[PDB]
Symmetry: C2
Subunit: 92 residues, 2 copies
């Protein structure tokens, strides 16, 4: 089975709905990261009330330092959220 076919499809929907919420048509704006953290990753990621973490997360994820998260690094954000929930249960 292509487990990756589930993710690629599950994200293109949440990626385009948010990245496409505003901007040209495929770029992530803070109003999505903070809104996506409180709306999507709100069951696994605490709903930040201050973009502050979103200000720090961008410092760890923003590679071009654009203050925004294109699709290449935006995914890398879920990976940073997915990695914490993966190393935690596997805490040797």
């Amino acid at each position: 089975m292509s487990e990756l076919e589930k993710a690629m499809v599950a994200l293109i929907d949440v990626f385009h709905q948010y990245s496409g919420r505003e901007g040209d048509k495929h770029k992530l704006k803070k109003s999505e990261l903070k809104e996506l953290i409180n709306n999507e990753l709100s069951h696994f990621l605490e709903e930040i009330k201050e973009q502050e973490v979103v200000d720090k997360v961008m410092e760890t994820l923003d590679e071009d330092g654009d203050g925004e998260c294109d699709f290449q690094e935006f995914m890398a954000f879920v990976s940073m959220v997915t990695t914490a929930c993966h190393e935690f249960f596997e805490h040797e």
Copy 2:
């Protein structure tokens, strides 16, 4: 629904099975990228017979230039594969 819960779970399985195939326990080695492209992304991504593209993809994905793809950029790879299948259908 947390569509992202599907991806995070769908990847932790393919991410740990490959990233955990060899190495410490959570790092991606070429033997996974080329093997993951021919085994997982083989229905959407052509099965490369030459790591050559994997040699070029790493040049576009490897940020630390480690010749390997940690979990933060490894995900960014699927995003580069997911983005091509997302902008193609949305080719205005």
